[PDB]
Write an enzyme that holds these catalytic residues in place. Structure first.
Site, PDB file in Angstrom:
ATOM      1  N   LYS A 102     -12.209  -0.731  -1.359  1.00 37.17           N
ATOM      2  CA  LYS A 102     -11.299   0.141  -2.113  1.00 37.17           C
ATOM      3  C   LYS A 102     -11.721   0.264  -3.601  1.00 37.17           C
ATOM      4  O   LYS A 102     -12.708   0.958  -3.887  1.00 37.17           O
ATOM      5  CB  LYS A 102      -9.814  -0.188  -1.869  1.00 37.17           C
ATOM      6  CG  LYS A 102      -9.499  -0.198  -0.346  1.00 37.17           C
ATOM      7  CD  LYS A 102      -8.032  -0.487  -0.012  1.00 37.17           C
ATOM      8  CE  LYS A 102      -7.646   0.097   1.332  1.00 37.17           C
ATOM      9  NZ  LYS A 102      -8.069  -0.779   2.420  1.00 37.17           N
ATOM     10  N   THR A 120       1.842   3.981  10.033  1.00 35.73           N
ATOM     11  CA  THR A 120       1.440   3.520   8.696  1.00 35.73           C
ATOM     12  C   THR A 120       2.662   3.237   7.798  1.00 35.73           C
ATOM     13  O   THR A 120       2.608   2.330   6.941  1.00 35.73           O
ATOM     14  CB  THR A 120       0.499   4.484   8.030  1.00 35.73           C
ATOM     15  OG1 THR A 120      -0.669   4.673   8.856  1.00 35.73           O
ATOM     16  CG2 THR A 120       0.117   4.008   6.602  1.00 35.73           C
ATOM     17  N   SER A 127       0.756  -1.286   0.000  1.00 33.68           N
ATOM     18  CA  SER A 127       0.000   0.000   0.000  1.00 33.68           C
ATOM     19  C   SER A 127       0.761   1.294   0.000  1.00 33.68           C
ATOM     20  O   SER A 127       0.282   2.266  -0.558  1.00 33.68           O
ATOM     21  CB  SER A 127      -1.037   0.036   1.106  1.00 33.68           C
ATOM     22  OG  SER A 127      -0.441  -0.312   2.339  1.00 33.68           O
ATOM     23  N   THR A 134     -22.352  -9.068  13.825  1.00 32.47           N
ATOM     24  CA  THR A 134     -23.441  -8.894  12.871  1.00 32.47           C
ATOM     25  C   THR A 134     -22.899  -8.983  11.454  1.00 32.47           C
ATOM     26  O   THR A 134     -21.817  -8.462  11.192  1.00 32.47           O
ATOM     27  CB  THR A 134     -24.112  -7.519  13.121  1.00 32.47           C
ATOM     28  OG1 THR A 134     -24.533  -7.437  14.485  1.00 32.47           O
ATOM     29  CG2 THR A 134     -25.326  -7.277  12.235  1.00 32.47           C
ATOM     30  N   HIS A 139      -4.988  -4.152  -2.344  1.00 32.63           N
ATOM     31  CA  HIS A 139      -4.644  -3.038  -3.211  1.00 32.63           C
ATOM     32  C   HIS A 139      -4.441  -3.463  -4.644  1.00 32.63           C
ATOM     33  O   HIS A 139      -3.731  -2.822  -5.408  1.00 32.63           O
ATOM     34  CB  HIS A 139      -3.439  -2.293  -2.685  1.00 32.63           C
ATOM     35  CG  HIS A 139      -3.735  -1.530  -1.457  1.00 32.63           C
ATOM     36  ND1 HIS A 139      -4.308  -0.276  -1.490  1.00 32.63           N
ATOM     37  CD2 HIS A 139      -3.624  -1.867  -0.151  1.00 32.63           C
ATOM     38  CE1 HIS A 139      -4.476   0.152  -0.251  1.00 32.63           C
ATOM     39  NE2 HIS A 139      -4.082  -0.796   0.580  1.00 32.63           N
TER      40      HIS A 139
HETATM   41  C1  LIG Z   1      -2.815  -4.310   2.517  1.00 36.66           C
HETATM   42  C2  LIG Z   1      -4.121  -3.992   3.283  1.00 36.66           C
HETATM   43  N1  LIG Z   1      -4.830  -5.053   3.717  1.00 36.66           N
HETATM   44  C3  LIG Z   1      -5.970  -4.904   4.386  1.00 36.66           C
HETATM   45  C4  LIG Z   1      -6.485  -3.639   4.658  1.00 36.66           C
HETATM   46  C5  LIG Z   1      -7.787  -3.635   5.418  1.00 36.66           C
HETATM   47  O1  LIG Z   1      -8.782  -3.354   4.534  1.00 36.66           O
HETATM   48  P1  LIG Z   1     -10.183  -2.992   5.060  1.00 36.66           P
HETATM   49  O2  LIG Z   1     -10.306  -1.356   4.977  1.00 36.66           O
HETATM   50  O3  LIG Z   1     -11.254  -3.538   4.009  1.00 36.66           O
HETATM   51  O4  LIG Z   1     -10.396  -3.524   6.422  1.00 36.66           O
HETATM   52  C6  LIG Z   1      -5.806  -2.471   4.256  1.00 36.66           C
HETATM   53  C7  LIG Z   1      -6.385  -1.065   4.585  1.00 36.66           C
HETATM   54  N2  LIG Z   1      -5.315  -0.069   4.823  1.00 36.66           N
HETATM   55  C8  LIG Z   1      -5.681   1.148   4.062  1.00 36.66           C
HETATM   56  C9  LIG Z   1      -4.443   1.758   3.402  1.00 36.66           C
HETATM   57  O5  LIG Z   1      -3.338   1.337   3.831  1.00 36.66           O
HETATM   58  O6  LIG Z   1      -4.634   2.631   2.499  1.00 36.66           O
HETATM   59  C10 LIG Z   1      -4.593  -2.658   3.557  1.00 36.66           C
HETATM   60  O7  LIG Z   1      -3.895  -1.543   3.154  1.00 36.66           O
HETATM   61  C1  LIG Z   2     -22.627  -8.591  24.369  1.00 39.57           C
HETATM   62  C2  LIG Z   2     -22.230  -8.361  22.921  1.00 39.57           C
HETATM   63  N1  LIG Z   2     -21.279  -7.415  22.703  1.00 39.57           N
HETATM   64  C3  LIG Z   2     -20.830  -7.165  21.471  1.00 39.57           C
HETATM   65  C4  LIG Z   2     -21.352  -7.847  20.347  1.00 39.57           C
HETATM   66  C5  LIG Z   2     -20.740  -7.382  19.019  1.00 39.57           C
HETATM   67  O1  LIG Z   2     -21.707  -6.564  18.260  1.00 39.57           O
HETATM   68  P1  LIG Z   2     -21.478  -6.190  16.688  1.00 39.57           P
HETATM   69  O2  LIG Z   2     -22.726  -6.828  15.914  1.00 39.57           O
HETATM   70  O3  LIG Z   2     -21.740  -4.607  16.606  1.00 39.57           O
HETATM   71  O4  LIG Z   2     -20.175  -6.707  16.129  1.00 39.57           O
HETATM   72  C6  LIG Z   2     -22.384  -8.844  20.497  1.00 39.57           C
HETATM   73  C7  LIG Z   2     -22.992  -9.604  19.266  1.00 39.57           C
HETATM   74  N2  LIG Z   2     -23.293 -11.023  19.625  1.00 39.57           N
HETATM   75  C8  LIG Z   2     -24.223 -11.598  18.645  1.00 39.57           C
HETATM   76  C9  LIG Z   2     -25.579 -11.816  19.304  1.00 39.57           C
HETATM   77  O5  LIG Z   2     -26.075 -10.838  19.891  1.00 39.57           O
HETATM   78  O6  LIG Z   2     -26.087 -12.952  19.209  1.00 39.57           O
HETATM   79  C10 LIG Z   2     -22.830  -9.102  21.838  1.00 39.57           C
HETATM   80  O7  LIG Z   2     -23.829 -10.056  22.081  1.00 39.57           O
END
Ligand SMILES: Cc1ncc(COP(=O)(O)O)c(CNCC(=O)O)c1O
Ligand SMILES: Cc1ncc(COP(=O)(O)O)c(CNCC(=O)O)c1O
Lengths: 398, 396
Positions: free
Chosen positions: A248, A365, A189, A278, A217
């Site tokens: 991206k 970074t 990157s 989720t 990337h």
């Molecule tokens: C090589 C690489 N792998 C994984 C990610 C994670 O991607 P997500 O945003 O979908 O979680 C990034 C993001 N880094 C952004 C950047 O360096 O521009 C990355 O640069």
């Molecule tokens: C107590 C608790 N805290 C955090 C999370 C993480 O939430 P996100 O969806 O925003 O990643 C969960 C989801 N547990 C799944 C369920 O409720 O069955 C949870 O039950």
């Protein structure tokens, strides 16, 4: 103890290193990328040109992406309302996983909230699936990968960036019966350079190791169908696991891994990072699916050709001014300043005087002493704002 | 050396414990919640009623949420196109963060891809900000929290679920100069019980520890403005850090922490999980903001009142049939079967024969021997559908 004192110290430390980050508040104008409104700290509004974004191909405003998202919102609502296990598995998600599988010509794919989560969950869960696994990791691997690799206790070996000989020296010294995995990136990157896919696969095949490539990337941008660099070089069949993002070049959000049915079913089944969160909003999944599908067509190929072209033109024009540009032949255009404070000073001037937004990039970074500006020319960066960018850089090095 | 052999082993082991999970493919009908189309494994389509979802208040189909999402898509596009540092900080994020801070009456808030990320990143990063930190963790803390707590090496102490005396015994044994943090939940997802906020805060104040509460299964649903249980008991000022989700009662996606500006600014500046990932799509942020804002109003209070009511009615009617329901006074209604295979059998029958979808819940989501069905009555489960459900249970 004073928790508040320690926080202060921790923050002070950032200022002392010149690496405290100020975020820039923007609103990209859909249908007019790369234009955005900059919400200045004084309360004013100013039109700027985004030059550092990762919506590499302008897919974030593509009508087929947006149509699919509007449709899904109307059909099923705002979110999935559950984890993949508890009512959060929808057609949009499996339709998306099949699209991704096809891209990489794999039996299966698994969607996560982000590519960060995908790397973290997968790399750590692999240690659980393959007791005693030794992970060989390129020294400049993304934080998500580093995090995944160290998360669970277990042997790791760091090889010098792109140094296949060091890789061989490390792997040959280890217990030949131990399961092994090599983790690297197709496009790094910040340097904008390519990982030596073929050489790594050759080593993996010689020593019986798994290959894990992060093409975050590259997907959407390389290969005749936008499947990445491994597709460009005809090497996808040699890669055990792909990691990619939908955030991206694909213009939306989320990430994934693509691999055999076995690998997916096992990760799916043992990764807390996948199980306990989720699932992606069906609208996000709709958009990303539409994006991938579109980028596989000859019309998508036009966007890639245009991107490559604009990157070449930008690099040419910047070299033509005598500038500290490192060119490894990718679409990423880094200009190394080498100092975190002077990098912010150049970035600040570009923003306020010329409407040029290019965030100053610092530690963690990039390595200290290699702080830089990182330009990302896209299909929508026409031969005229390239003209606008260059003139500003010229005016500024006075 | 033979990788597939290891894979087949790991998978078999799931079938052998009976805990191998089959996902159910559904499409919720916007504007007609809790109705959904079930995409059966044979290729057919069947109308079903979702009874186990976490869109607790029907916000996922709320017109103000959807309108804000459609608007944002048209204004700025599909995604942010960057991390918070590299072009992904937008007004939508900043307005969303202010909305959350305001909800918990805190100086600041920080949004992550999910509440899972928020817990993981924050709890692990706190070990870095407070060298030698001892984390005291409730035995039934969510996976996200456990994972955050263990991620970085460092002292952890597990206290028996809701057992404040064990907590005291643990904390009093430790080095009094060491920084301490207590991490617990306001509403536990599977039992549906409440964490003893006041007693924990009392202990935290006595021993100079930070309090970290996960209100994921409470925000939107408790307190006069939907800020959670701490708001309901008038204790928000006693909580150092809040963790919440935007994906459940709020009806959208993403998660956050809420704490003081110094606490937020340090997490933001140090956590790899926040720094290195694309920011939430502006449309997601827009929807969630509208959802929180709406649930703070008297109109939102109506949805909460209705939820609580429906939960009470469901619990009454299930006890009136002689059923293994544990009631801890929350909106969650668990029916304990105690066996992973029999739980799937009951769930299968409810789906196929009655159009009732309630996923069978097993290990690692709940301890072995406590496998269960977990009902989540919402404002949209009218007295008709509750009546439908109980009749279906009875005949079974
Ligand atoms: C090589 C690489 N792998 C994984 C990610 C994670 O991607 P997500 O945003 O979908 O979680 C990034 C993001 N880094 C952004 C950047 O360096 O521009 C990355 O640069
Ligand atoms: C107590 C608790 N805290 C955090 C999370 C993480 O939430 P996100 O969806 O925003 O990643 C969960 C989801 N547990 C799944 C369920 O409720 O069955 C949870 O039950």
């Amino acid at each position: 103890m004073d928790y508040n004192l320690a926080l202060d110290k921790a923050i002070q430390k950032l200022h002392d290193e010149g690496r405290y980050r100020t975020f820039i508040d923007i609103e990209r104008e859909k249908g007019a990328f790369p234009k955005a409104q900059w919400n200045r700290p004084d309360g004013g509004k100013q039109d700027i040109t985004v030059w550092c974004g990762n919506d590499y191909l302008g897919m974030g405003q593509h009508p087929v992406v947006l149509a699919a998202m509007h449709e899904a919102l109307e059909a099923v609502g705002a979110g999935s309302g559950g984890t993949r296990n508890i009512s959060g598995t929808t057609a949009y998600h499996r339709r998306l996983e099949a699209e991704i599988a096809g891209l990489h010509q794999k039996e299966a794919a698994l969607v996560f909230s982000s590519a960060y989560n995908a790397n973290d969950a997968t790399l750590s869960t692999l240690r659980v699936l393959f007791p005693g696994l030794i992970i060989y990791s390129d020294s400049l691997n993304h934080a998500s990968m580093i995090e995944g690799i160290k998360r669970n206790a277990g042997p790791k070996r760091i090889f010098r960036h792109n140094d296949v000989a060091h890789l061989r020296e490390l792997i040959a010294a280890d217990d030949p019966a131990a399961p092994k995995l090599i983790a690297f990136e197709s496009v790094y990157s910040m340097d904008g350079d390519f990982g030596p896919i073929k050489e790594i696969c050759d080593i993996a095949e010689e020593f019986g190791a798994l290959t894990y490539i992060d093409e975050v990337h590259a997907v959407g941008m390389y290969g005749p169908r936008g499947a990445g660099v491994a597709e460009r070089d005809g090497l996808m069949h040699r890669i055990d696991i792909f990691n990619g993002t939908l955030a991206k070049a694909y213009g939306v959000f989320g990430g994934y891994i693509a691999a055999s049915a076995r690998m997916v079913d096992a990760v799916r089944s043992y990764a807390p990072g996948f199980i306990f969160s989720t699932s992606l909003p069906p609208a996000i999944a709709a958009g990303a699916q539409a994006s991938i599908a579109f980028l596989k067509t000859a019309e998508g190929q036009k966007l890639r050709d245009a991107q490559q072209m604009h990157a070449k033109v930008l690099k040419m024009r910047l070299k033509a001014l005598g500038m500290p540009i490192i060119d490894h032949g990718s679409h990423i255009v880094p200009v190394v300043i080498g100092d975190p404070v002077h990098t912010k000073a150049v970035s600040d001037m570009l923003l306020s005087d010329y409407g040029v937004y290019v965030q100053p990039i610092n530690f963690p970074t990039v390595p200290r002493g290699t702080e830089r500006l990182r330009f990302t020319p896209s299909p929508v960066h026409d031969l005229k704002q390239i003209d606008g960018l260059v003139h500003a850089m010229d005016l500024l090095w006075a």
